[PDB]
Amino acid sequence: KVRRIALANQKGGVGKTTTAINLAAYLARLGKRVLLVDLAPQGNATSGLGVRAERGVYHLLQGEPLEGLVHPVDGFHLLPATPDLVGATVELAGAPTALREALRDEGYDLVLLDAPPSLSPLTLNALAAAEGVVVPVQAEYYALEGVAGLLATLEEVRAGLNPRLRLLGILVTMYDGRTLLAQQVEAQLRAHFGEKVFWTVIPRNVRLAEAPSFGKTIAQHAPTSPGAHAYRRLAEEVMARVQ
Amino acid sequence: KVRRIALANQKGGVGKTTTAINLAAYLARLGKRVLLVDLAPQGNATSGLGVRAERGVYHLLQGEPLEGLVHPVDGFHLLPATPDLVGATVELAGAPTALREALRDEGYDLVLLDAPPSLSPLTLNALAAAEGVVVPVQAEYYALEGVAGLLATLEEVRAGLNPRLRLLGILVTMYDGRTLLAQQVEAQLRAHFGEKVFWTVIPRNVRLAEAPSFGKTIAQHAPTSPGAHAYRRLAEEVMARVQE
Ligand SMILES: Nc1ncnc2c1ncn2[C@@H]1O[C@H](COP(=O)(O)OP(=O)(O)OP(=O)(O)O)[C@@H](O)[C@H]1O
Ligand SMILES: Nc1ncnc2c1ncn2[C@@H]1O[C@H](COP(=O)(O)OP(=O)(O)OP(=O)(O)O)[C@@H](O)[C@H]1O
Ligand SMILES: [Mg+2]
Ligand SMILES: [Mg+2]
Known part of the structure; x- marks a missing residue:
């Protein structure tokens, strides 16, 4: 079953x-105990x-207990990023399972891992520790162009680093539904990947x-805005796919 | 003088x-010989x-001649990225001046280096080889929040790795001037950094x-659109600053 995403x-x-x-915000509102880990x-x-923390996920990798590193926010917990992650990008080279082995998160129902825009050791640790992957694809050309390669990489990971x-x-x-580009991009994604693409956009x-x-989730800042409704629906979809 | 940006x-x-x-596109239209290097x-x-090339900047770093790797596009030259750059990120670790030493670009008026979203060896090589830096800042919160730290990092590089x-x-x-967020972000950027912020938005x-x-620059795709006019004005502003 999928716990870490x-x-x-x-x-x-x-x-x-x-x-x-925002996925964490709405998963928490569904009654789930959620841990958000910032790996960027x-x-x-x-x-x-x-x-703003001095201790976070970096220290968890250094042997510090999870319980004393988390911060309560909007109904869920956050294992923060600290300036140490800059050096961690180098220190973790060759150690892709470091996070997996340090994440004693059995007390949580779901764990979300936010990765940086790269295939650095931090992202690799996220993929090696996760069971499921949500791939956000901006409704524009460059993001669309990278999906094929991205999916192949995930296969390489599942090939040996993380079979599950x-x-x-x-x-x-x-x-932005008013632009032809956004429409064409969503169309291409659903045409090529079908059911893999979430219903919610x-x-x-x-x-x-x-x-x-404001340091707030969309559920706190604008609870009735289009983005709030969208992420609320996504949380439901995510739970459906996890089950 | 500033040649590499x-x-x-x-x-x-x-x-x-x-x-x-787009900056390359309009600089070329100003009569400049431009080289765009894709380091991402x-x-x-x-x-x-x-x-879609099989040889590019990675091969340049290996010692292959620059003139045999560039592709002519919209009036300028492109030194393309290739799948080899994935392994370059690891290869360049410890060699921040590899690009600087391999960039025999004296035949160009201006050289633009497109860096990836990180402080990896590829970005470091870009900073160690350039004379000037254009820092794009999206008119939203996260981009604004990172500016202070980014400028500090640029200073670190100047303090040793690359004094120029x-x-x-x-x-x-x-x-999007219709949103209060964009307005507040630009306002704060100019209040905190003033003259450092380009006039052109x-x-x-x-x-x-x-x-x-469409594999086209904005100058080719929509030359009279808001973005095209903006980048045309930016090219002029960049030249003005390069000359100063
Ligand atoms: N649906 C949306 N509508 C408007 N603003 C959004 C939306 N989604 C995200 N943003 C904004 O777009 C910017 C990019 O998003 P975000 O920072 O979440 O991306 P990543 O997290 O994809 O970025 P990075 O690659 O730097 O980690 C941010 O300034 C964010 O606030
Ligand atoms: N001013 C703009 N108006 C509308 N779309 C834009 C604008 N500037 C860029 N974009 C689009 O926004 C997305 C992000 O821009 P771009 O890819 O150039 O960023 P980077 O190059 O900042 O990104 P990365 O960090 O991945 O290298 C792209 O899909 C791009 O086409
Ligand atoms: Mg991010
Ligand atoms: Mg880019």
């Missing part, structure tokens, strides 16, 4: 963090939740970008 | 590639210009995102 895509700015935060050196998920890793689903994000709406500046 | 920002999707391609493993600048590296300017990108306009799907 990685939000991954080496393409930058396709909604990995926004999805990790940039630490956007952490900053977007109003947290599976694609939970492809999520169309930052979708995340629409482009500025409240989603505003939320982080 | 890096388009860098570890924040993903802030317009590095879109800016590198993703290879978006390459794909966005309709190029200088911030050419901060470019506000994907700006790139507006959010879908044709800029469409162009790459």
Whole structure:
């Protein structure tokens, strides 16, 4: 069964963090105990939740107990990114299972891993520790162009590094239905990957970008906005696919 | 003087590639001989210009002649990314000056280096080889939040790795003036960094995102669109700053 879900895509700015935060927010509202782990050196998920920490996931890898590293936020827990992740990108080379072996998260129902836009050791650790992968794909050309290669890479990972890793689903994000490009991109994704693509599409709406500046999830910042409804529906879909 | 300009920002999707391609397009139209080097493993600048090559910057780093690796596109030259760059990220670790030493680009007026969203050896090589840096900053919160740290990192590089590296300017990108968020972000950027922020703001306009799907620059795809006018004005501003 799927417990750990990685939000991954080496393409930058396709909604990995926004999805990790808001998926956690609505999964928590479904009564699930959720842990959000920020593995990006940039630490956007952490900053977007109003947290500034000196200890986080980096220290978990150094033997520190999980319980004393988490921060309570909007109904779930966050294992924060710290400036140490910069060096961790190098230190973890050759150690892709480090996170998997340090994640004593049995107390949680679901664990979300937010990865940086790369195939660095941090992203590899996320993929090696996860059971399912949600791939956010921005409704534009560059993001669409990288899917084929991205899916092949996930297969390489499942080939030996993590045999139980599976694609939970492809999520169309930052979708503006008024543009032909967004329509054409969603169409190509559903034509080639069919059921792999989530039904729910995340629409482009500025409240989603505003939320982080207040350290709030979309459920806290604009509970009735298009993005809120979209992520609420996604949480339901995710649970359906996990079951 | 400034010849090599890096388009860098570890924040993903802030317009590095879109800016590198369109800036090259308008600099070429100003009569400049331009070379665009795609250092991102993703290879978006390459794909966005309709190029699919088996040899590129990786082979340049191996010692192969630059003139036999470039592709002519929209009036300028492209030194393409190749699947070999995935392994280059690991190969260049410890060799931050590899690109600088291999860039025999004296035949070009300007050289643009498109870096990936990270501080990997590829981005480091870009910073160690460039004289100026154009930092694209999406008009939203996350991009704004990273600027301080980014400028600090640029200073570190100048403090040792590359003393000639200088911030050419901060470019506000994907700006939708109809949103209060975009307005507040540009306002804060100019309040905190003033003159460092380019006058030219790139507006959010879908044709800029469409162009790459046709392997065309915005100057080819939609020359009279908001994005095209913006990048044309930017090319002029960059030249003005390069001359200063
Ligand atoms: N649906 C949306 N509508 C509007 N703004 C959005 C939406 N999804 C995300 N954003 C904004 O777009 C930007 C890019 O998203 P985000 O930072 O989540 O991507 P990643 O997390 O994909 O990026 P990176 O590659 O840097 O880790 C952010 O400024 C974010 O607030
Ligand atoms: N001003 C704009 N208006 C509309 N779309 C834009 C604009 N600038 C760029 N885009 C689109 O936004 C996405 C992100 O831009 P781009 O890929 O150039 O960023 P980077 O090059 O910042 O990304 P990465 O971090 O992955 O290298 C692309 O799909 C691009 O086509
Ligand atoms: Mg992110
Ligand atoms: Mg890019």
